[PDB]
Amino acid sequence: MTWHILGAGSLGSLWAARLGRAGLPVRLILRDRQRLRRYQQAGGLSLVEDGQASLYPIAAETPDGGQPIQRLLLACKAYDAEEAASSVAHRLAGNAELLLLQNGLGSQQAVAARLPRSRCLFASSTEGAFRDGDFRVVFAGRGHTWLGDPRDTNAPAWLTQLSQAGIPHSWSDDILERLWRKLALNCAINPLTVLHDCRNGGLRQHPEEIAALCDELGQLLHASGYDAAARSLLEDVRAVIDATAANYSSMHQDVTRGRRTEIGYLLGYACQHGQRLGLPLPRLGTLLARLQAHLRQRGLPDR
Ligand SMILES: NC(=O)c1ccc[n+]([C@@H]2O[C@H](COP(=O)([O-])OP(=O)(O)OC[C@H]3O[C@@H](n4cnc5c(N)ncnc54)[C@H](OP(=O)(O)O)[C@@H]3O)[C@@H](O)[C@H]2O)c1
């Protein structure tokens, strides 16, 4: 019943540390043998909570070696999920279950199609963590993780050992309604924060734009069958603005650091989904066209 962890980043290490320190079998899957040596010279994962650093010596390995994988946590970026899961597709057993921690939509379905003999569970986390070195992660803020599977709504029995490890979670019968809620939340805030180069509190100065975006995002939510999310969206957005008024959004921090943006699974997925239907979403489309041009202007990928 080993917890295999693919993607020893921010969320990946935070999960690996909490699972391993609670006595559960955990195994890190690092990229190559070079990373495995750099991990063994460090001695384990360093977790920083309220300034206090602790060393968790979690066993690690490479994709080629190891035992069969019956439970895998995919904790990489959405644009790397397809390539990550395929690197250990040769070790997946017939009863393997995958926990997909990716943000947005699109990559989860791509992983499910690439691995049809495995069960892919969807997750939506609000926990905060960032890296401060190759094997050092700061537990920046507590949060919650929703779980669920659209095909198989029965909850697995191993949810209890997530509680033992201190990992807050809840099983949702309609997990896609959660992901669409968080996706529409991301589209109304993060693209404008990049184009205007401002904190989330700065969006108060653009109230007409927020209302126009939430309107088109509300139509997209209703056509997707999520009526409750579309009615409360405008007030859900304004609540997040006040709660994170002093913060820079995640997409703003990616562009600032010259990193790739998960746009292809957030605003890009939303504009494509409305096209698959029949909804004209012009303001979301021009917002996407501006954000793509903003990314290309700095040599960053537009997808
Ligand atoms: N971080 C948060 O607080 C947070 C909160 C909510 C949601 N999320 C979502 O969770 C996901 C992960 O975010 P993160 O901040 O944890 O990212 P991150 O810091 O970039 O960690 C991703 C990790 O995956 C590894 N990886 C990528 N492709 C791989 C491959 N093919 N084989 C092996 N390892 C591979 C990377 O290795 P390298 O070190 O070599 O690059 C990296 O360690 C994202 O979709 C994000 O939107 C994150």
UniProtKB/Swiss-Prot annotation:
Gene Ontology MF term list = 2-dehydropantoate 2-reductase activity; NADP binding
Tell me which domain of life the UniProt entry assigns to the organism this sequence originates from.
Answer: Bacteria
- Provide the reaction this enzyme catalyses: (R)-pantoate + NADP(+) = 2-dehydropantoate + NADPH + H(+)
SUPFAM superfamilies, sorted: 6-phosphogluconate dehydrogenase C-terminal domain-like, NAD(P)-binding Rossmann-fold domains
Give the residue range of the signal peptide. Answer: none
Q: Where does substrate bind?
A: 103, 186, 190, 200, 250
Record flagged with keyword Lipoprotein: no
UniProt-annotated catalytic positions: 182 (proton donor)
Tell me which residues bind NADP(+).
Answer: 7-12, 35, 103, 129, 131, 262
Per its UniProt entry, what is the enzyme's top EC class, as one word? oxidoreductase
Q: Which GO BP terms sit in this record? A: pantothenate biosynthetic process
* UniProt-listed Enzyme Commission number(s): 1.1.1.169
Entry function: Catalyzes the NADPH-dependent reduction of ketopantoate into pantoic acid.
NCBIfam families named in the record: apbA_panE, PRK05708.1
Task: Give the UniProt family note.
Answer: Belongs to the ketopantoate reductase family.
From the Swiss-Prot or TrEMBL record, give the protein name.
Answer: 2-dehydropantoate 2-reductase
